[PDB]
Amino acid sequence: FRKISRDRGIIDKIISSMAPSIYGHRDIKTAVACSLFGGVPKNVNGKHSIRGDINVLLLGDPGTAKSQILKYVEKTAHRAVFATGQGASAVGLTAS
DNA sequence: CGATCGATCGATCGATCGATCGATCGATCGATCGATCGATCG
Numbered sequence A: 001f002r003k004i005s006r007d008r009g010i011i012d013k014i015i016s017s018m019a020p021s022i023y024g025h026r027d028i029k030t031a032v033a034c035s036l037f038g039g040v041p042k043n044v045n046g047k048h049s050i051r052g053d054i055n056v057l058l059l060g061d062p063g064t065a066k067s068q069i070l071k072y073v074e075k076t077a078h079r080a081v082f083a084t085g086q087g088a089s090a091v092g093l094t095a096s
Numbered sequence B: 001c002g003a004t005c006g007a008t009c010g011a012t013c014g015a016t017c018g019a020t021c022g023a024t025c026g027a028t029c030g031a032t033c034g035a036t037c038g039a040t041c042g
């Protein structure tokens, strides 16, 4: 890990390795890459907290593999939970 | 060992408000037709 961490173009190797069999859409691939690594959460005592999670919205015309990206994120991420807008319910998301 | 209310969440129907659309009343300028007339030369 330390060896690759200091290699040339480490950020470009990461982004170009997001979804290898998807062409272009590099502004999404860089957005997918950043959402996987995430930020650093902060909690100031006696004040409110700050989230470190990165939120991505993929809006596009039919095609463009928006769904296949979420299928690639499901397998690569450590703990991935997949949901669908119509197949989910208010109880099925919050609690039972 | 059996009979009677209770709470929950999915599934279905339906009724109510709203998005969508064809129609008419009021208007008007684009296109045209004719009259007016000032200008030109035999």
Ligand SMILES: Nc1ncnc2c1ncn2[C@@H]1O[C@H](COP(=O)(O)OP(=O)(O)O)[C@@H](O)[C@H]1O
Pocket: A021, A022, A023, A024, A025, A061, A062, A063, A064, A065, A066, A067, A068
């Ligand atoms: N930019 C792209 N490059 C390569 N293949 C693509 C691309 N966009 C779509 N595809 C092909 O289309 C399919 C994705 O379709 P789909 O997930 O239904 O897109 P969406 O859900 O965003 O409409 C994949 O199997 C993929 O092979």
